[PDB]
C-alpha cells in the first residue's frame, strides 16, 4: 500500500517537473508543488552545486541520490522537512536529466527515492499517518 502510493506521488511530481506540465494523493501532490517548488527556488544555487558534485548524467549515476539519502539519514534524525527536501532535490535532478535527454532515468530516479524512504523508514511513515501526515504537516 504505502510503497505504491509513495511511488505514484513521487514519480508524478518528478515527471511533472521534468516536463513542465484518491484524495490523499491529490493533496500530497498539491503540497509537493507548493513546498517542493519553494525549496527548489529558495535553494537553487546550493542545488546546482550539489548536482554538479554528484555528476548525475545517466541511469547508473541515479544510485547517487539513494546514497545521498542514506547519508542524510545517518544521524538518526527523521522529519517531514528532510523528506520533502530530498524529494525536491530529486525533482531538481530529474529536470536536468530531461534536458540532457535522459528521460530514461526519471522513473528509476523516483523508484530509488521511494526505495530508500519506504524501506528504511517504513514504520516511522506509518506512525506519522503516511501521506496524510505529510499533508497535515505542511497544511496552510
Amino acid at each position: 500500500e504505502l510503497y505504491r502510493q509513495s511511488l505514484e506521488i513521487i514519480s508524478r511530481y518528478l515527471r511533472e517537473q521534468a516536463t513542465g506540465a484518491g484524495a490523499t494523493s491529490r493533496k500530497a501532490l498539491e503540497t509537493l508543488r507548493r513546498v517542493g517548488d519553494g525549496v527548489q527556488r529558495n535553494h537553487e544555487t546550493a542545488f546546482q552545486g550539489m548536482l554538479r558534485k554528484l555528476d548525475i548524467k545517466n541511469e547508473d549515476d541515479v544510485k547517487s541520490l539513494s546514497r545521498v539519502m542514506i547519508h542524510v539519514f545517518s544521524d538518526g534524525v527523521t522529519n517531514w522537512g528532510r523528506i520533502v527536501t530530498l524529494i525536491s532535490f530529486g525533482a531538481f535532478v530529474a529536470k536536468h536529466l530531461k534536458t540532457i535527454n535522459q528521460e530514461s532515468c526519471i522513473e528509476p530516479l523516483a523508484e530509488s527515492i521511494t526505495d530508500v524512504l519506504v524501506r528504511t523508514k517504513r514504520d516511522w511513515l506509518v506512525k506519522q499517518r503516511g501521506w496524510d501526515g505529510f499533508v497535515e504537516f505542511f497544511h496552510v
Binding site: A46, V68, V77, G81, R82, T85, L86
Partner: peptide, 13 residues
Amino acid sequence: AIAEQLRRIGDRF
C-alpha cells in the same frame, strides 16, 4: 557537506 546542507534545509521546517 551535501548531506549537511540538505539536513539543514529540512530541519529548518
